[PDB]
Amino acid sequence: ATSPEGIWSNSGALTFEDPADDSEILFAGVRDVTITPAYEHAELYTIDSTFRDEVKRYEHNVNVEITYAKFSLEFAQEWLGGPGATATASQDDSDPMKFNLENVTPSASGGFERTTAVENVVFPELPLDSATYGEYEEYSLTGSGRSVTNLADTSG
Amino acid sequence: ATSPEGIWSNSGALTFEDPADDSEILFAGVRDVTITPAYEHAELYTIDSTFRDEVKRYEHNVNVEITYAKFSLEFAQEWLGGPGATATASQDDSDPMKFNLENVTPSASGGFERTTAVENVVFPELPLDSATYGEYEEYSLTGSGRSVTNLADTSG
Amino acid sequence: ATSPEGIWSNSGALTFEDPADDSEILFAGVRDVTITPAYEHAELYTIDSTFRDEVKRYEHNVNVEITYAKFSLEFAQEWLGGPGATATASQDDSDPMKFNLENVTPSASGGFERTTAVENVVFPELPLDSATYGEYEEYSLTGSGRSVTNLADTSG
Amino acid sequence: ATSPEGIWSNSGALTFEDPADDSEILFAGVRDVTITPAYEHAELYTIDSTFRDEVKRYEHNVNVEITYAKFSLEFAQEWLGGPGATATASQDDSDPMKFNLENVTPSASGGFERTTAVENVVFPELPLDSATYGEYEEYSLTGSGRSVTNLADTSG
Amino acid sequence: ATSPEGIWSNSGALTFEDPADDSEILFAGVRDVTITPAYEHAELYTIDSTFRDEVKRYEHNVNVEITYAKFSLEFAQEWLGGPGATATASQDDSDPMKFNLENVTPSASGGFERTTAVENVVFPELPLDSATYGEYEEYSLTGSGRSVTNLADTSG
Amino acid sequence: ATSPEGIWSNSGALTFEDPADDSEILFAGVRDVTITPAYEHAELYTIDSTFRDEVKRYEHNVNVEITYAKFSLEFAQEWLGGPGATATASQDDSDPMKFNLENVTPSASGGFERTTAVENVVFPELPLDSATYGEYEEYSLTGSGRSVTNLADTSG
Amino acid sequence: ATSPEGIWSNSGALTFEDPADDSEILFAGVRDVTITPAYEHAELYTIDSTFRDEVKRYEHNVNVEITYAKFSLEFAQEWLGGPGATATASQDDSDPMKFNLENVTPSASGGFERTTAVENVVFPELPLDSATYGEYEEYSLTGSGRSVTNLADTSG
Amino acid sequence: ATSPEGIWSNSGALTFEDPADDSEILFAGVRDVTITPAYEHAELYTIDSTFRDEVKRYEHNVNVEITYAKFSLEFAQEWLGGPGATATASQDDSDPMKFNLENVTPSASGGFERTTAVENVVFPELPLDSATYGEYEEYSLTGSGRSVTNLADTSG
Amino acid sequence: ATTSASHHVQAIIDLLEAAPDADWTPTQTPTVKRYWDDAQSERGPGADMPAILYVWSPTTSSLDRFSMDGDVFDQNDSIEVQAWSFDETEVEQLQGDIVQILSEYLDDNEVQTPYSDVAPTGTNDFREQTPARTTGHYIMSVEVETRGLSETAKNA
Amino acid sequence: ATTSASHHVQAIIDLLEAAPDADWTPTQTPTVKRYWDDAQSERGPGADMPAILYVWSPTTSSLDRFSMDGDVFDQNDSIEVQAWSFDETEVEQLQGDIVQILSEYLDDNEVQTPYSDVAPTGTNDFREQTPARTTGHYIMSVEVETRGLSETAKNA
């Protein structure tokens, strides 16, 4: 087994990819990155016992939320266009843009390099402008990925 | 492609227009500006799998919210008046004033100049007076645009 | 208008008055007298400009700091007693004693004679005893008045 | 009226009393003595006027500060012991020792004798040892009296 | 180019003007004069680099600080009166008096003469009396100018 | 009771003890010694009166501050080692070393001899090196005892 | 490696450059020069241990502070003008002027020659006037460089 | 036991080592050196008693402060380079340089010789230039060691 | 380079003798002497000989400690140069010349001289002392200070 | 070791006499004497004899209290060493020799000397006092100070 170790936030490299091509989508300048695979849990109880009889998972999703401070036209225009298209205005169609996402971090003493990969992240809303007087524009995305496709030590 | 870049909030240049005339409606003195296109997402899950089978967009709108410190008689009297009219009093009619909105910002290192434009923004409520002791009156609008009509680099 | 001129401190005569009667309250032996009208300032800035759009004043008072070396038993018993009374012990009531204050000061060459009058000066705290071994007692007051009622050339 | 007058510090006679039995507690060797009745002030301002509309006083106390160079076991063992007792060690109880404090002082001319008396003075901290090589010990007290019970001329 | 050079403080001539009529307001006898244009700086940093990514400036003002020894009734009665007026008492109104300030100063060698000029200086507080026994009165101002209207060599 | 009297600082002998054994821990060469019992005070005020209604004490401790000039290798190794041990290196454990501390001091005329004893003094930080070129090293301690176990006249 | 050695301050030559051209900006007459690289440090601690698990650095800058006594009209008009311009008045724009800065300093024995260079120094505020009567003007700067571009021995 | 004893500051020999290769990093010419092992202390108090119930220590670090007057190029290029490297410019990376510090100092009597040694000292900021006219340069360091690795008598 | 003498008096003689004939204001170059080169009755030039400069050290040179290394002394060296002539204008020209000649070298990092700093620091006129009846020497002088780091052989 | 002398004058004589014949700059090792060893009419060397050093204590030695314990004095001592010769180069070389001889032992721990510090603190040249007309001694000196912890009788 590999020892638990601290991870320094600023060491992370986040990238997005178009799952039609595996082509990179230019994105940069994060400040927060939270990724949380989750499930709904259902617990069984009955008159037989005060203790839980069973517990089971359903509705897997991965919560992705990112705060970033460098705006990307490519990322925004992919989100507007939906799958396999780039657009400069809102599109009247039902498919949201699905991004693959990967985040790579060295552990703080180099014991491992954690790579997390998530498929088909979709964001219900996209901050286009996020201006506050005396600050740089800071954009927060919240969205749901379908599944974690990789979580492993990618170091030597 | 174009490199992602920081944006500085005080470089914004928000403007409103009457969609009947393309006449500018006098508005000035912003301090906060958020523009966020959004959709409702419905996710499909069934007994077949714990993972999501489908996701789809609907109920598109653009959340606009603006905090500003210079009061405008034109803006308020257009909002009272409704489409194509101006009023010095509440009107008893069903049509909200629809504003076209545009915001333009140079990026921090001049890599691009993002223009965001939104059609048919309406505000359910308009703060006329916002007096607080020992402060300039600060006014907040929250409204919904129909669609983002433009999002592009407008640098030469 | 009157030529600006230096001032010899000691030529200034300071007096306190009961605002109910315009009667003098005996006080003497000042070493320092600072009288400073003040307001709070609010400056307006917006995303339109880096420069100040507006500035405004509010919360007027006058700071009154005095250092003195002759103890006044009347002045202390007025401060205890509150408006329109004298007392030989702390009073359990909500009203501070209000002193009208006037300072009259000839200019160094006699070129003008400043009268400064301050209404409703109140003092949050009062030293009764301020002993140091091998010295005469010296007392510091900090208080504040509502407004300057007069600042004029009294000469001729 | 009584004319304001200078005070020689060393003419001051200071004493502490137990408020239960009215007995003196032995204390001596003062160097500085500051007694300052005080109140918190609250000032009302509103949009009607930039000038103070009302002022009121509350939360009365008397700040007592003393520097002294003769150590007293009685004063310390009273402070340890709390009201109506003496102790040779810290007491685990919630009542601080309350001292009445009286200070009497002729003016420089003997034209009046200021007597100041303060009820229920309490000291949050007490120096037991305050050594510094090549000097005699010197000690400091800070404490809060409840109120001034007397401020009068006691001459004649 | 113009060679950098030392400056003798006393060679500087300072004046205040009313910005309505460009009339001088009589003021004299300074001892220190500090004029410091400033901005607030916002620095952008993000996870992708430990170095500063961008820096921008906002909230321009000019700090003006003056020590002076000759009292002016005109300067004070202007400050009381507010824009376009003089008064012999505090005014209950929201506009502070705005002074244009100009300081003209030769190089120590006479190699240039810098003129510094500042618009719309305002002083939150004004010393009216500033007495100390056995000395002449001395006064201090602190205030904010809106901007520098001129900084150039006015020689030749 | 015993007459208050001045104290010559150097007459005071300070000693440190291990509370496990009542054994001495070698420590010497003090310059300053401050021992100050304290409590936090809570004063009760209500709308019924401007005067304090009650006062109470809690959170007893004794401030212990020392300046000294002879380095003790035993004292330092006790502070590293924690309760009931000595160490030549930092210990990764949660218990600070607790020192019993006693200062015995004859009064100036020998009129009394106070013994001050403090239980369970702990020091948050310990100076090891405290070099200044061209001087002997001097070290400062700040610590806190649980209570005063003795404050009595030891004489006869 | 090179033997550490003392340094005579005055042997240091400081120069400022426009980053657009590598042209010199005339500046002279320094009295102090402090250049101090810094990062923010984040130390990790957990319930596992009292000792620090990890430490990491972020938010790099270089503090630059200068005292000087020769006024530069070019340096001031550059600071007003912002990047790639000079101005005789305050500019209403978002970019601070960025100076490259280099200090070259022979070691006391000439044993080595330290060249320090800092990129993109910016100053939040600039003194234009700094008068004290009976003295030459002296000016203080504080600013922040992005990074150190060179720190090397430049002897031979 | 070993008797406590005075220490002549100048007798101390201070060195830095690279913790990887155990090689010396050249550093010289100290004027002040303070080494202070510290912990945060947490104290338990409850309604049961006014005395402290428990005390515990956490967040060990060693505060290291140094004043020095000989510049070291190697020390600075280590600090810039980070662990296991040297650099001539700021590095955009998250690892600070970690120095082992050892200081060895005889007693004034020669009666013992303390060796103090500290692991993984880091300095948040580093002065590169610190010039004042008419003097030699003088520099300050402040930094945090992880722990004391050694404190013993190394004599004999 | 130009001097390398073991002592300041000879160093300044070597600097004065090294001066070009073009850098003296009079018709012919003065003669430079140790003060003890001449007997008192012979001291000063005769008629039809060029003017004479007498050099010596009038006050104690300091040897300050530079650091805890004990590796160099900060040595501050005092000198006086007297100009002697029968011409009351020639002594004045020689004073002017000596200040100019020794105002080279001002911050040698031991380039020409064996010093960090050679400076004129004051000047005297003694022309008032020559009586008017008898022809006799006019005298004027330059006071010189000189600073450097001088080795100790402590470290072999 | 090298002295064990009972008093400072003999200590410095012993240090100068312990110098190897290699460490003097002249061909002949000087003779070291107390100032009182020779009478005035025969003080200084004869011709064809080695140069003479005279040692004595010119000013008050100080016994500062080191600490509150009284166990030791911080003794500070002063000595002058005068070199006499007919050769002006020889006294200069001897002065340099005495400085670089007595700069051994600069920071003893009572190792060679019975002191913490023996230091040259200043140097005097008196060559200007020797009349040029006669043969006669030149004189130069080193002032040297000495510091150490000197035991008291108090604690036997």
Numbering used by the authors:
A (entry chain SF), B (entry chain SA), C (entry chain AM), D (entry chain AN), E (entry chain AR), F (entry chain AO), ...: 2 to 157
What does the paper say about this structure?
The empty structure corresponds to a postinfection state. Compared to its DNA-filled counterpart, the empty virus lacks the tape measure protein (TMP), baseplate hub (BPH), and tail fibers (TFs), indicating that these parts are jettisoned during DNA ejection. However, the length of the tail tube remains unaltered, demonstrating that it does not contract during DNA ejection, similar to siphoviruses that infect bacteria. (C) Structure of the tail of the empty virus. The dsDNA, TMP, and baseplate are missing. Instead, a density appears to plug the capsid-facing side of the portal. Otherwise, the portal and the components of the tail tube are unchanged in width, length, and conformation, indicating a rigid structure. In the empty virus, the TMP and TDS are absent, demonstrating that they are released during DNA ejection. Genome release in HFTV1 triggers structural changes in the distal tail region, including BPH detachment and TF dissociation.
Here, we present the near-atomic resolution structure of Haloferax tailed virus 1 (HFTV1), an archaeal virus thriving in extreme salinity. Through single-particle analysis, we obtained near-atomic resolution maps of DNA-filled and empty virions, enabling us to assemble full atomic models of the virus pre- and post-DNA release, including all structural protein components. The full atomic structure revealed that the virus has a length of 1350 Å and an icosahedral head with a diameter of ~600 Å. The tail has a length of 560 Å and terminates into a baseplate with three radiating TFs of ~190 Å in length.
